[PDB]
Design a protein around this ligand. Structure first.
Ligand SMILES: *[C@@H]1O[C@H](CO)[C@@H](O)[C@H](O)[C@H]1NC(C)=O
Lengths: 49, 213, 49
């Protein structure tokens, strides 16, 4: 959904349609998301600080 | 219509035990005497066991035979194999008025050094030319492995018509040797300026050339 | 022939309390309309036009 905002999400309505249904049939109890960082010429290039 | 069924190929490491079977088709295996002959290659067969349990005087004790009449099969058991046992074993059932020999069982247990393909060439002789024939003989010898490809050349064009080559063979030098023959007409031999034989062996190519002189 | 390297594989099937995931398809005949017929579109035994 396109929007022009940075904070305090609008009160408009938008439903969610499926993309894929996976019949796996296993346990699940924890989850964690992945993020990507950039290594430009400003940073030394080490993932420490 | 009684035929004896024997496995074609049996291999076993020396010092172990192996069972050689012989199955009868129609008649029961216990009806008639089953005999095994141990024949060396290029030699006359020799009896190794008879009467299904009786050993000839001279053979060792390992050659033991057994009869399983329920399965219509004759079993020959060998224990402690070694080098000279590499022979052909035929189970024999004369039955009555007709020897039915078995198919046969061989043995397979396991230093050839690498070498350079020495190549020699000869042109057709004048006596052959007077007898309206011409043959170029290419010889490959003292090499290993025995997998060489020959390709006759007429100056620059390859020649395949009339090309006859021999499979590599064993010699006393522990290497291999082969041959190649190119049958030609007398006018074709003198038509081209030169004839050459190219031999490919392990990537390296050794080429000799001859000319009509 | 009795001592050569043979490539042997086993294909096994599983039966659990899960819907079918990998299974064969079904053929397709013609289609009729505007007459009282019975149809089975995976969720109902409906009779009608
Ligand atoms: C799934 O998780 C539940 C609790 O989280 C546990 O009791 C159950 O044994 C688990 N089953 C399997 C198949 O892992």
């Amino acid at each position: 959904t396109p929007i022009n905002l940075v904070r305090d999400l609008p009160q408009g309505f938008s439903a969610l349609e499926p993309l894929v249904d996976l019949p796996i049939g296993i346990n699940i109890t924890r989850f964690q998301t992945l993020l990507a960082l950039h290594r430009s010429y400003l940073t030394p290039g080490d993932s420490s600080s | 219509n009684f035929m004896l069924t024997q496995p074609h190929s049996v291999s076993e490491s020396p010092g172990k035990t192996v069972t050689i079977s012989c199955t009868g088709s129609s008649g029961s295996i216990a009806s008639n005497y089953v005999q095994w002959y141990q024949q060396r290659p290029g030699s006359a067969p020799t009896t190794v066991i008879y009467e299904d349990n009786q050993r000839p005087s001279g053979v060792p004790d390992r050659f033991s035979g057994s009869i399983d009449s329920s399965s219509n099969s004759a079993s020959l058991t060998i224990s402690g194999l070694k080098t000279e046992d590499e022979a052909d074993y035929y189970c024999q059932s004369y039955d009555s008025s007709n020897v039915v020999f078995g198919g046969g069982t061989k043995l397979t247990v396991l230093g050839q050094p690498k070498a350079a393909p020495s190549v020699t060439l000869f042109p057709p002789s004048s006596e052959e030319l007077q007898a309206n024939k011409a043959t170029l003989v290419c010889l490959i010898s003292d090499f290993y492995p025995g997998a060489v490809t020959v390709a006759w050349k007429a100056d620059s064009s390859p020649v395949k018509a009339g090309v006859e080559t021999t499979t590599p063979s064993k010699q006393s030098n522990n290497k291999y040797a082969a041959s190649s023959y190119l049958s030609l007409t007398p006018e074709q031999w003198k038509s081209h300026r030169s004839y050459s034989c190219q031999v490919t062996h392990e990537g390296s190519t050794v080429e000799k050339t001859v000319a009509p002189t | 022939v009795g001592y050569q390297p043979y490539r042997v594989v086993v294909l096994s099937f599983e039966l659990l309390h899960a819907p079918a995931t990998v299974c064969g398809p079904k053929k397709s005949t013609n289609l009729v309309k505007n007459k009282c017929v019975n149809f089975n579109f995976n969720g109902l035994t409906g009779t009608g036009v």
